Design a protein around this ligand. Sequence first.
Ligand code: HEM
Ligand code: HEM
Ligand SMILES: N=C(Nc1ccc(CCNCc2cccc(Cl)c2)cc1)c1cccs1
Ligand SMILES: N=C(Nc1ccc(CCNCc2cccc(Cl)c2)cc1)c1cccs1
Ligand SMILES: C[C@H](O)[C@H](O)[C@H]1CNc2nc(N)[nH]c(=O)c2N1
Ligand SMILES: C[C@H](O)[C@H](O)[C@H]1CNc2nc(N)[nH]c(=O)c2N1
Ligand SMILES: [Zn+2]
Lengths: 420, 420
Amino acid sequence: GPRFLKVKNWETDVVLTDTLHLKSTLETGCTEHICMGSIMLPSQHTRKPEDVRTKDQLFPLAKEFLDQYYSSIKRFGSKAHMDRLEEVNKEIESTSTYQLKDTELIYGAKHAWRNASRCVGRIQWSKLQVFDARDCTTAHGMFNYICNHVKYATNKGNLRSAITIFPQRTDGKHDFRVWNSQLIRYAGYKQPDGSTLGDPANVQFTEICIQQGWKAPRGRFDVLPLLLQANGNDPELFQIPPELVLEVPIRHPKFDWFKDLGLKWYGLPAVSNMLLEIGGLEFSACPFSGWYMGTEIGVRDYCDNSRYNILEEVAKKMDLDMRKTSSLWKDQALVEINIAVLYSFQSDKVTIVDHHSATESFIKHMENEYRCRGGCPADWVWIVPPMSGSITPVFHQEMLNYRLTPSFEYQPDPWNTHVW
Amino acid sequence: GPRFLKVKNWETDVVLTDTLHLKSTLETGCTEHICMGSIMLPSQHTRKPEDVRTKDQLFPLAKEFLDQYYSSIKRFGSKAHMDRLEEVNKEIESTSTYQLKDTELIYGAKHAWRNASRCVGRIQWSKLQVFDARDCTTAHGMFNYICNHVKYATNKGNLRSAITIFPQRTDGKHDFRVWNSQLIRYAGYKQPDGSTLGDPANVQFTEICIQQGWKAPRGRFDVLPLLLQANGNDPELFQIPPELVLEVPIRHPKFDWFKDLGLKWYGLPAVSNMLLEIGGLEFSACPFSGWYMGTEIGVRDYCDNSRYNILEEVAKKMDLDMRKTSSLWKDQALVEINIAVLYSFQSDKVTIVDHHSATESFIKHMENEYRCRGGCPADWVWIVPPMSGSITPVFHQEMLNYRLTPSFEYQPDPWNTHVW
Ligand code: HEM
Ligand code: HEM
Ligand SMILES: N=C(Nc1ccc(CCNCc2cccc(Cl)c2)cc1)c1cccs1
Ligand SMILES: N=C(Nc1ccc(CCNCc2cccc(Cl)c2)cc1)c1cccs1
Ligand SMILES: C[C@H](O)[C@H](O)[C@H]1CNc2nc(N)[nH]c(=O)c2N1
Ligand SMILES: C[C@H](O)[C@H](O)[C@H]1CNc2nc(N)[nH]c(=O)c2N1
Ligand SMILES: [Zn+2]
């Protein structure tokens, strides 16, 4: 179409028409001569470590959001709409910023998720619990909110999606940041013997903690301490209450020897290093959580070469023919590890979804979004699971990727800027 | 870089600099606001079913190629170069087209493959056998060349890459087309009982053949007849000599019951429906072949829902728990089917490569191409295998995709145009 883009499913031949892309103003990183679809950080809005948006750069963005928000409730042009535009406008003029009402914040958070093109679990987007932490002023206050978020979200295993929003960035005053990449994660330690204990992905953070006084248990699965930063002040260490950290011992439903591998993982995945942008406002500390898709742990966390990298050990115990890759011993061990993960979480009755169920519901979500919103931004490279790709329905689904706002963006690691 | 694009491997942290993209003039389908990286046919050059390039549209393209060809041999600007440019130019003026010398044709074919961004086996690109069939004038002549190609390429199981190039398109005279999607493929028949015998992907072609007199054996693995079109004349049916069609009975190295499934596949993959473009010239009939990557058969050909779709049967025989997707019975059966395929071809000593070995050599190829050519166009969506994606090195490799020429493009199915 000369404006209406079509995406087809090559497995079912269903074709959809996308008009929603016409509302994108942000750049993807691609040009008519080159495609950057497989670049992790095409740095098209990875949040500038620079200053902060100015009054002139903030009102247009603030206005774009309100127009969008009010059109949502079918009140575009209303007095309320125009009244609100004048308030924010006048408010930005005097304070160089503005405050979102509670309703606009909830709408913005849900849509940041709704617009997350790399997220396969968006069918859940409208069911998000928003915790307003904008009145927080210290690291102890942040610790409290986080513990409450973790308890709520965990819900004794029956996981519930949630996000806690700390004060937005200002200019000078300074901002809030959760130095951890995820609320709950395991430490990593580079052994002197060239070995690496724990999660290799968290070695640089583990060092920051240790230097701050953390008493690393020097174990394989040590839950890291929270390193919180409020109002641009130095970060502070806090130990999330163990009773609040739900974990699952990994065992196999057929291989009794699997237990002995000593594998375990935490049940609540919670991202804490991203930035939430709503109406030109930037919320640099907005930890959010949902639940795991089995492959995140079984394929990536456990089998990534630069992660726990457990394929050999498992393969050995299975007495596999690891003399040639053609035996597919890696693939075979990979399937068992993922069967163990699902079986375990399900046994402990901790919420989790397998890549088969997760991808099918995403297709349903896409069809829903095309019907009611005119489209759905999706990043194929990220939506397709790291194992058994073509046996899942998303592999055969063409997807259009574009940037819509509100949204979640990436931001510089706090220790690569924060002074002192 | 303000011109030098960088691709990184997130598993090894190696970063490469791409300058080669600066030589792309063709469009990818993406824009700064939207990415079409997962669209199968972004119709950016899927060969226009229209007329044919004119003299004015042909010389610039012819010139671009020669300049490229002569720069290859480090003779840009030479007398030979300029002499050749004037010949082709003058030749296009009188005949409205031109003829590539043997050397330019071989260089062009190898580079069409070298530039194939969706191909994971390009490390082999410089080792291609080029068969010049430009003197062919009838369907019988095409049949002969094809049989010879198949015999050469097959080489009794020790497969060798090759391509046979029939006469280029002209204007009126008319062109050559191999109506088959691949030289060797199985027929498909829609059963009256809603069933579908054979390969569902080939049902429409099987009908064309049958209507042309083909005596379909109405079996599950019936090698289709060749339907050749020379000089725009109606296509003619030919039966490739069975002794020339190498096939492999699929059996498992542990499950003796696998044999009984009656699975078999042919050893030579040969694409015959694409169009080769060199110097503005279009070779609408240029069948090419190499060898299989295990997953093409085991994952896609056998397990695609719209293909043989054999996951249940296999799963049943394995006595798997197919009551819930969480058991990963599909994944488990998928690994065994692929172990069977590799084991079988290897047993019969027919060339084949597993996704692990194939993807690692592609990484090596990429590193080679960045060193000597300044880059390598790669389509991530296609390069990453349909199973166990993240355990292969290409999954963690960022790839830049752009169109370089010479190249292989798609073209309209011959029966959707050819009259009579
Ligand atoms: C309801 C359950 C949910 C599931 C199963 C789910 C699953 C996923 C998965 C598998 C990924 C890939 C993660 C990776 O590869 O590292 C992902 C990415 C993402 N999810 Fe979801 N998600 C859910 C809820 C949420 C929530 C509550 C939010 C936000 C409010 C969210 C925002 C995102 C974002 C921003 C990404 C992209 C991360 C990036 O770009 O680095 N997800 N999700
Ligand atoms: C030497 C062994 C080779 C291997 C293992 C290999 C493997 C592959 C694989 C796995 C695909 C995916 C096919 C699909 O998903 O349908 C592919 C695509 C492709 N290969 Fe190669 N290849 C090889 C040789 C060749 C040769 C000889 C040529 C041409 C001279 C070639 C040209 C291409 C092209 C054009 C595509 C893209 C197809 C499309 O866009 O639809 N390949 N190759
Ligand atoms: N299923 C989840 N897991 C999850 C989601 C997102 C991420 C973030 C992955 N970020 C990768 C990345 C890519 C590029 C640059 C950077 Cl800094 C980071 C991690 C786990 C959920 C997390 C919160 C809700 S669901
Ligand atoms: N390994 C091979 N297999 C193979 C390569 C390419 C194709 C072509 C796949 N085309 C898919 C497609 C995609 C979009 C539109 C159309 Cl018409 C067709 C098939 C098998 C080789 C074939 C020739 C040499 S290697
Ligand atoms: C290089 C490539 O973009 C990178 O490895 C991507 C591929 N797809 C992914 N998909 C998900 N869900 N998560 C990831 O971290 C990645 N990594
Ligand atoms: C929709 C999506 O682009 C499509 O299913 C692609 C994905 N990757 C692929 N990769 C290869 N090698 N072959 C294919 O046919 C496909 N299909
Ligand atoms: Zn793109």
